């Protein structure tokens, strides 16, 4: 239906989405190098203010998992920090303690700060931290309020949602006027199979797909991150002429385009 | 006096101090590489939590000069930010708006957070942002209140202090019980001369010298900073066997030692 109103009905369309921009110099590096429009920036990242592009969104953050670099909240609510004053290292920690009003403040802050740095087009969430029903409600409400399109998957099977969340999630997912995407995450999959993952996209039937990558340049700074092998594999696969050819087979779509059509 | 009560009267004594640790993975790297005890850590830095060593202080920040990486206030006082929510880019921007109560909350916050990551022995200020009289007062009160020795220089010549501040700064510089160091900074002097500057320390009389360096390791992330040539120059100087030998002729003194002697 969305594809319909974009006159793209029946086509295979692809939103290729670069995550975790602003987190390291290497990530921004890859974003610059790769030449593709779409990503979202982590406003608390040190390099958040080093990124520029045509299809940029705000990657909302409420957790900081790595030993380093770590990020700190913008606002001063206690429920959001753990306890060097960084965001919690795990979702479990977050979901157990964060109060909704404190979260909402923090996200409002993140969005407004972003809007001082590029023109945000969309909104999504690192580690799907907005998965607590509670917050998911905040997330969608915010997206509407700021006229930014949120990332909504068609189904939440395979996202490891905690089961007690399902009933209410399913609930407002079903109730949302927002377009849903067919979600794809090659994160979790072994680095050496990444190439083949991207090459196999050639086999997908028509439909609107959302594929996320975490490309980072191979760098000493980058290798301080535990998941670097998977971040580099994204980067090399995307630069591989075969993959570039496969990707060309999709009509490429930006959130900017989608936003024009909803707001 | 202080040299006297350390039983060091008459000696050539050096505090060698590594600045901006926590700023980049290249700085932290240089600290490790150099194996020397003393530096201080920019707590709002992304790599703040990646450093450990025996003589670490908190490098307080109230300004973020580069276009990236940039740093944000821990607390949410309005007078500390600019208008993207970063620390302002110049002393001038800062001094014309910062409130003292807010600065106090902020530096307090930065101190608390540093305690969580290591055992702080001292206190200094990035770009000497505490030079506004007002805030210099704040700064020494806090050094008191947390039993950390503050950076206090002997002369304030060539630190570009706005002239109308000299009177008040001279007053409290005069009244403070805290020991004053003989400030040396090769920051300013051309990268290719640097090796010279370090060797010419051979020619220094007895006294208490504070030498600040910004050593950083050759790195794509490091070189994202405009002043990298001089950062890397410090590193190559201090890792040169000649310069280590000349530094040997000094009695190395940690801020830690100073702290026991005074608290
Ligand atoms: Mg993420
Ligand atoms: Mg500094």
UniProtKB/Swiss-Prot annotation, chains A, B:
Superkingdom of origin organism: Bacteria
Pfam families on file: YdjC
Active site: 19 (proton acceptor), 214 (proton donor)
Keyword Metal-binding (UniProt): yes
Cofactor: Mg(2+)
Xref: CDD domains: YdjC_TTHB029_like
E.C. number(s) listed in UniProt: 3.5.1.-
Keywords linked to the UniProt accession: Carbohydrate metabolism, Hydrolase, Magnesium, Metal-binding, Plasmid
Gene Ontology terms for molecular function: hydrolase activity; magnesium ion binding
Binding site for Mg(2+): 20, 59, 126
GO BP annotation list: carbohydrate metabolic process
Keyword Phosphoprotein among record annotations: no
InterPro entries cross-referenced by the UniProt entry: Glyco_hydro/deAcase_b/a-brl, YdjC-like
Family the entry assigns: Belongs to the YdjC deacetylase family.
Functional description taken from the UniProt entry: Probably catalyzes the deacetylation of acetylated carbohydrates an important step in the degradation of oligosaccharides.
Subunit structure, interactors included: Homodimer.
Name this polypeptide is given: Carbohydrate deacetylase
Organism the protein comes from: Thermus thermophilus (strain ATCC 27634 / DSM 579 / HB8)
